[PDB]
Amino acid sequence: QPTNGVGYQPYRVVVLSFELLHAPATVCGPKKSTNLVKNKCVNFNFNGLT
């Protein structure tokens, strides 16, 4: 009830669990690719694995 008061009131809980894994990525950050280099030394990122 609105009459419950602060600790007494309802609170919405979200838990975001993640299947953070080396298996097929499908949900990712506000993130955008480069071209792919081959046969030269580079920093790299795939799916935010780096």
Binding site: L21, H22, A23, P24
Partner: peptide, 24 residues
């Protein structure tokens, strides 16, 4: 009727490539 299972029912643990390797 009945029979021994022999070596049926092995399956992949995960979507990771590995090769020429013994693992457990």
């Amino acid at each position: 009727a009945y029979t021994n299972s022999f070596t049926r029912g092995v399956y992949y643990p995960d979507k990771v490539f590995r090769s020429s390797v013994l693992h457990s």
